[PDB]
Design a protein around this nucleic acid. Structure first.
Length: 187
RNA sequence: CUAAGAAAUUCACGGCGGGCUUGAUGUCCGCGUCUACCUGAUUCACUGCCGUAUAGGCAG
């Protein structure tokens, strides 16, 4: 956790950086699924909260063995033309800590209507009256649009950075690099 | 401080009966429309699960 690897987005004359970010995030998700482990933290060094911008720089946080296992994986092939890869340097000691969390939303009422059909055996009009169409959740959070190998539907994954703390305790990490209770340093 | 200031047009009404517009007609010769383009920007806010929950989380 003491080390970090920094990825900068090369500007692209054919693609805006958002879909490049989505592609690389899917590649690192596949790399972490293949590699395993629960000590991989993500960071957005230039996250703009004014317009919910993802940013043009990426920071991944891991240990030395985890970082060399990640860079040894051949997922990096086919993406070197658009990114920078620095060195697994030690993170600065006086750094505030913040958490990253995947915030999902119930933006589609018909999914929950189908769910309550499978839970309470209600009819179509019962679910229509019980759940209006205005219950959609709109999030002013940065997001990435990806499709999964298990389910081919394209899903949107919101990423939100927590408040700055002064210390961090041990926690877990998901397959996306998002923390289920962990923290990443800010610098 | 205005060619300032003021004001009831209104009651009633049968327009109609009749009619052959028809004869004839050459539109027409000629014609280089070209050249050059990322539709796509996160544009699939989607599928399922824990929960009575629309309250609120979780899974790829």
């Amino acid at each position: 956790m003491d080390h970090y690897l920094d990825i900068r987005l090369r500007p692209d004359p054919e693609f805006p950086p958002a879909q490049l970010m989505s592609v690389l995030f899917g590649k690192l998700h596949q790399a972490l699924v293949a590699q395993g482990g629960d000590r991989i933290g993500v960071s957005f060094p230039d996250l703009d909260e004014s317009r919910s911008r993802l940013g043009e720089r990426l920071r991944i946080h891991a240990s030395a063995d985890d970082l060399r296992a990640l860079l040894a994986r051949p997922w990096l092939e086919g993406l070197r033309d658009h990114l920078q890869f620095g060195e697994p340097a030690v993170v600065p000691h006086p750094t505030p800590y913040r958490q990253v969390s995947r915030v999902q939303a119930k933006s589609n009422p018909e999914r929950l209507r189908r769910r309550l059909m499978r839970r309470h055996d209600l009819s179509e009009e019962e679910a229509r009256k019980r759940i209006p169409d205005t219950v959609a959740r709109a999030l002013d959070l940065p997001f990435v649009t990806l499709r999964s190998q298990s389910t081919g539907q394209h899903f949107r994954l919101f990423i939100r950075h927590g408040p700055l703390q002064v210390t961090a305790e041990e926690g877990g990490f998901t397959c996306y690099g998002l923390s289920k209770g962990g923290f990443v340093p800010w610098f």
